[PDB]
Design a binder for this molecule. Structure first.
Ligand SMILES: [Zn+2]
Ligand SMILES: [Zn+2]
Lengths: 507, 521
């Protein structure tokens, strides 16, 4: 067994806390499977590969993770149970170590894991083994708000697997990890339920692909499309929101505010076409301070191109008709690649085909429809938000799939044109409804990667799986670039929090 | 007992369901000294600095009337003792006296909230999910509450990064009354504290060195000794806000009670409505106009990328400020190498497009006296206003002209309790010519700004309760609310000069919150 002395639990925290609470005795007996508690050992693995990397806390047991939203703190350890699935005609060994709180586990040697409290178990063992996970700390108990590191338990391949195969498929030992609370685990102080943050679990909304919408243009979603070979690292400015609910770049919450602006008209020129320089405010009606940390006012376009839309004008003063002001609305185009599109400075220029009906010094409102033509349409180039004479500052960071053999997963939506030839599309990372749900919930991220699975509703089985990152993008494990053929009435389901080393099943 | 005729409840028989929590004896093997406290302070109830609060018919049910964090600053003897120690561990004992009239009817609820729980959005039924006790406002004998110091470490330090066990009061009924007369039956309540037997200090340090333990004090200065903080004159009288003015924004004379200067405020009395620079231009209209590249008031170049709306000390209202500009030559033309000097009248219009002091330019004027050198240093000394044309003191000028926005402004301030208006300090300004009697109202005197900057004491609440004391009579005239943003409000219905003796002063009474009903003037 692991050489560990007994560590105190919540009875140490008795004279500094006020309520003496208990829980259900049936939860203290049943062994519940850990959320990331499964791994398989293969003949392809090498010694020194980490397999579990578990950690102490109430997030292992989904009964304690539901009871934790009623209390103020906790203290105590757990009991781990490891099962294997092998037979007598095999060979190979595994090791299970006990790692302290502030010790960094980063690419350890197979020799160096024997310098911990460890057990070495063969892969032939018939009975499930029991390991202790104690609560080492330097205080009396843990708070549900202030998070601090805890004791981990780490599995590692010690000796490679030797067996003889059956056919075109090789033998494989599958392992499961189940936990239950120790007799000294306890909670501390009853509060109102579901009031404190930091205990709210991360979820996804149950909305199918036909009911969601794009986050970079106000068009519905058409299909899912994996990223091409020459696209490896994108950087957009709309549809950016982390899983904790922090809006980055020029991302806002309303669907209608995407590629939309509002303000007054100041200038008029007519070299060939009508120009109409326009000063802009925010989308609520406040004067835009140009020294804000944002790159631009929220909801301006974020790609090069010629956005075709309708601009309407409603004048302030009542000219006629018994005090009802006049209206006008025409087509226009905003080009985003020129040196006139400077929304950080506060000027956006439009273009109207031979229609001189737009009165100056009366406020307007732009409503986008589609593109003018496919000329200068690059959907992965950030425009110069200040024109020349200044560089782009304080953007969202670039995102990229770092795992070998993984591509980005986009949401494709086709687009109308004014005239010409082409079938263009705008790809986004997350839908707008996911952005709104992440902003309203604001649940914390326990890890850096989350695991989701696409669900077909009539069978209830998974079609593929992807990795949802903290920065707000998804990656799949595929080797081609093609639209994903799935039923349209499907959705994603959140499964667990994983590491950066989880290998997806090939798509 | 016998004086009340059985008309009121005599005692409350209800406890909070809390466990005995350890104190400073748990912390003994890891601390240094474990100092002790005088036994008279241990056994006598003394009024807390959060002592006073009232229940009124203006209060809605569900308002937080009291929010006491645990600390040594809950006792006025321990708050003086705690300025020479390093830490503490242990609880307190709180006593609430709320013996109201026999005709009223209302109830209060007191609950115990854990350390890391949010208290900002409690409903009246969420407060019953804690260990609570319900007390009506007619009980004769005072009630006793615990405050047991729940923590997850051995003791505390004087740092501000550990939340502590709180007590929270809430109004639970509407405070009705069935007296026959239309007379004020507003209940006055008091809070009295003393330390628990399991309370101790930790480690002797130099006294009054650390922050986080300095107490808030007011200076004893009469109204005849105060000075205006928006214009370099003396304060004449106090004057309530009119019914048209509901919120103000004036970047000079602004300082929080914690000791933070906001807007373009500074400390020097002579630097209000004054600047300093170099003449760079000459404009020959009917009047003579000049352009001045202004610097800071100490003699350093003004960087426009600073986090301020303007250089500190510029005028902060629309009008035409009248003063005297003077020149002293950087070179020596004559007289044993002594420089020559010129000094003439001036006028600074601040509502036009030529008053952009954030960009660096302030344009002045002199009438029919074009005797002013170029590329020589200047200084402006304000006297008053030349005419009341375009004079509005509650509009902030554009510090970068037209086609730009004001940045890093101080926030606007307004009263929120019903029936209350603002209380100003009014001084009357001289004019050059015309008919008028203008006035500039400030939120705070300049001496209070300097005192709050020198003390830098923390605030234990949002509002402080002060009273105006007449020292020859020994009787209080009125009371007011001093807010943490740096402004005072009174409870009145008119707009008139407050007629008081000019040798009276304000006296700091207690810390209150924003639901305190002031007495009507
Ligand atoms: Zn034109
Ligand atoms: Zn001249």
């Amino acid at each position: 067994v692991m050489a560990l002395e007994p560590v105190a639990g919540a009875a140490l925290a008795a004279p500094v806390t006020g309520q003496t609470n208990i829980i259900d005795p049936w939860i203290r007996a049943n062994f519940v499977q850990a959320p990331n508690g499964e791994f398989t050992v293969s003949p392809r693995n090498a010694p020194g590969e980490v397999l579990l990397n578990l950690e102490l806390g109430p997030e292992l047991n989904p009964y304690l993770a539901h009871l934790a939203r009623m209390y103020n703190g906790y203290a105590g350890g757990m009991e781990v149970q490891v099962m294997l699935a092998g037979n007598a005609f095999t060979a190979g060994k595994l090791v299970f170590a006990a790692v302290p709180p502030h010790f960094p586990v980063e690419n350890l040697s197979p020799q160096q894991i024997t310098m911990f409290p460890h057990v070495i178990i063969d892969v032939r063992t018939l009975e499930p083994v029991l390991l202790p996970l104690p609560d080492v700390r330097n205080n009396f108990f843990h708070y549900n708000q202030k998070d601090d590191p805890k004791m981990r338990i780490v599995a590692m391949l010690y000796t490679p697997l030797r067996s003889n195969g059956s056919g075109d498929d090789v033998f494989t030992v599958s392992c499961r990890v189940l936990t239950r609370p120790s007799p000294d685990f306890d909670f501390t102080y009853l509060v109102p339920p579901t009031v404190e943050s930091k205990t709210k679990p991360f979820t996804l909304p149950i909305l199918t692909l036909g009911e969601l919408s794009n986050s970079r243009f106000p068009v519905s979603i058409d299909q899912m499309y994996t990223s091409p070979n020459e696209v490896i690292s994108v950087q957009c400015q709309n549809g950016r929101c982390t899983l904790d609910g922090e809006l980055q770049g020029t991302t806002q919450l309303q669907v209608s505010g995407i590629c939309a602006f509002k303000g007054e008209v100041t200038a008029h020129l007519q070299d060939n076409d009508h120009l109409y320089n326009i000063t802009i405010t925010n989308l609520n009606g406040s004067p835009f301070d140009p020294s804000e940390d944002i790159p631009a006012p929220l909801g301006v376009p974020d790609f090069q191109g010629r956005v075709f839309g309708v601009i309407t004008q409603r004048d302030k003063q009542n000219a006629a008709g018994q005090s009802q002001p006049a209206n006008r609305g025409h087509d226009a185009v905003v080009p985003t690649y020129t040196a006139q599109y400077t929304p950080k400075l506060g000027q956006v220029q439009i273009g109207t085909w031979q229609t001189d009906d737009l009165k100056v010094n009366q406020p307007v409102k732009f409503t986008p429809v589609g593109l003018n033509d496919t000329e200068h349409f690059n959907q992965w180039v950030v425009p110069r938000y200040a024109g020349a004479l200044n560089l782009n500052t304080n953007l969202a960071p670039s995102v990229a799939p770092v795992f070998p053999g993984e591509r980005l997963l986009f949401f494709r939506s086709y687009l109308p044109l004014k005239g010409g030839y082409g079938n263009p599309a705008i790809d986004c990372l997350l839908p707008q409804e996911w952005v709104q749900h992440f902003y309203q919930e604001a649940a914390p991220s326990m890890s850096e990667v989350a695991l989701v699975r696409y669900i077909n509703p009539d069978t209830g089985r998974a079609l593929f799986e992807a990795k949802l990152h903290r920065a707000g993008f998804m990656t799949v494990s595929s080797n081609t670039s093609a639209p994903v053929v799935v039923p349209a009435n499907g959705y994603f389901r959140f499964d667990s929090w994983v590491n950066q080393f989880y290998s997806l099943a090939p798509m």
